[PDB]
Amino acid sequence: MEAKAIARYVRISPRKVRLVVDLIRGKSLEEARNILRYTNKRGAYFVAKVLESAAANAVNNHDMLEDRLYVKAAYVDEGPALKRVLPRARGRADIIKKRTSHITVILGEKHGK
Amino acid sequence: VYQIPVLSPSGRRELAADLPAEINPHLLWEVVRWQLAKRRRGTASTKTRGEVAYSGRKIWPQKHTGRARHGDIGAPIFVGGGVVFGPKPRDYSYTLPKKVRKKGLAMAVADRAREGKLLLVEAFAGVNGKTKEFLAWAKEAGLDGSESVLLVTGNELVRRAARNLPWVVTLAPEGLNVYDIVRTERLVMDLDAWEVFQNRIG
């Protein structure tokens, strides 16, 4: 079986957090944890939460044994945009968009004997 | 056309008639078109850039703004602006020549009489504003409602009767129009109604 957790409307830029997600793809849960703890990014925190919430769905909802699950799949999609006004010189007003991500960690049991 | 049946209470006699030998499947069409058009309401409308609610101010200056050039926001190019050559209320009626109105009416009957889908009648029997009464008379006239029927009489109670039949269109005799003949498969008149018809024409 495979299990997944999704953090949605997370107030962070996709392109930013996608960077650490790609860092755990295909790895054991044991390793992945050790990676996020010392990855120096704001995205670590969030991805950590999603991952741990995914495991906590495998063992308690799908029977998967924590010692055998890897990061089968992981991705982050673009949530809706927070458009905000940025006042500029000569009365301009730009619009910066505070971006938003949909983090999706998806776990599976390693095919170990 | 000539040979038309009559339901006398006595026996199904025949009555000859001076109806047009041939028909013009165009002036019939020209008449129907005229009917269906004079009855339109011409009630679609829209607002030009002048009747739209926006102010007549100019959006930006003509030049040096670095955008396109514009007047009001009622201009047709603007979303929410007025429309161009859209519908206004109009009268679709036109005065079709009277001779053609008459002639088409004869022809519309002749086309019925020719196919022997005309039947004249008298007095009825089951009259009185109950369809049940009518419906049996009709049954006893080969009008099983196997086909759409235009019933023409000046008898209120007879018109009251059949009025609710999903295959009957009822009409007083001065209301003889041709649209209400071509839809109907079958034409049925009382004699006093046939009489006036022979007077409208000629």
Partner: protein, 50 residues
């Protein structure tokens, strides 16, 4: 006779008004107006019959 059986004479309605729609029709883009100045302009020419 029947309503489906109406239909007028082949000429008659004619309809098929002209346009200024696409290419292919031929009568497209400039719509019968040619590159032009005063006449390709909206309101048009002065009364040409005089």
């Amino acid at each position: 006779m029947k309503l489906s059986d109406l239909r007028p004479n082949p000429g008659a309605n004619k309809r098929r008004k002209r346009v200024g729609r696409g290419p292919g029709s031929g009568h497209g883009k400039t719509a019968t107006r040619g590159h032009k100045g005063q006449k390709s302009r909206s309101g048009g020419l002065k009364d040409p019959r005089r």
